């Protein structure tokens, strides 16, 4: 399925569920009350985390799904020094 991620100021995101469950507090926000009878969006409202950092953590979701337990060189994730501090807080809130 595909899951949906609000940002702080609009900036909607849509990531595959098997890609966004690699984080820790998405697997919890998606295991909460409600059977999720629709099973198409089940949007999560990240009220506090900004848009660029959410884009970078979605890119990390794709990156970690692609490169998990691989025998290649695991090419480096490019972190902007400006986004580095906020992305650290997000990856603290978004477990793993």
């Amino acid at each position: 399925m595909y899951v949906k991620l609000i940002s702080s100021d609009g900036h909607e995101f849509i990531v595959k569920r098997e890609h966004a469950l690699t984080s820790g507090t998405i697997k919890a926000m998606l295991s909460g009350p409600g059977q999720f009878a629709e099973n198409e969006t089940n949007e999560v409202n990240f009220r506090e985390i900004p848009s660029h950092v959410l884009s970078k953590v979605c890119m990390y979701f794709t990156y970690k799904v692609r490169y998990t337990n691989s025998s290649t060189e695991i090419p480096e994730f490019p972190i902007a020094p400006e986004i580095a501090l906020e992305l650290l807080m997000a990856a603290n809130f978004l477990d793993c």
Partner: protein
């Protein structure tokens, strides 16, 4: 468990785990060195089932994972280097945690076998990448980030 919770630390900052994973820990020659061999994966395992703080830091900032990868005998006793590493990183031994001299345990490998074992046991996390990018550019984080996150930044 009682002894570990009494936090036994030598003058080098070594805990029970640090010496149990160190080949440099002296073993008594009088009827003992023929039986007790360091590093030993069993004792480390028995020291992790009892709940030793695996991310402990010594005077040099080395954890148990830093010390174990300093082992210079990966062929004579490979299992005692393998069966300990999987024993070390199973309770939360931060593979990317960095010592006081800014050395990742991958950097302190001195052995292809040990570094490939660490790489196989290493699991990536955006927390680690973000912390490493923060410290590699020296952004002021004190009184701006979570209190528990300052220690994590200090890890990398």
């Amino acid at each position: 468990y009682n002894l570990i919770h009494l936090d036994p630390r030598t003058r080098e900052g070594f805990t029970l785990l640090h010496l149990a994973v160190n080949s440099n820990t002296p073993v008594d020659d009088f009827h003992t060195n023929d039986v007790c061999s360091f590093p030993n994966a069993l004792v480390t395992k028995l020291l992790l089932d009892c709940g030793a703080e695996v991310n402990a830091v010594d005077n040099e900032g080395n954890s148990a994972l830093h010390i174990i990868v300093q082992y210079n005998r990966p062929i004579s006793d490979f299992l005692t280097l393998h069966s300990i590493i999987i024993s070390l990183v199973e309770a939360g031994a931060h593979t990317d945690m960095t010592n006081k001299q800014n050395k990742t345990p991958l950097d302190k490998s001195t052995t292809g076998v040990s570094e490939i074992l660490l790489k196989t046991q290493m699991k990536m996390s955006l927390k680690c990448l973000a912390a490493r990018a923060v410290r590699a550019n020296d952004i002021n984080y004190q009184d701006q980030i979570p209190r528990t996150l300052e220690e994590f930044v200090g890890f990398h």
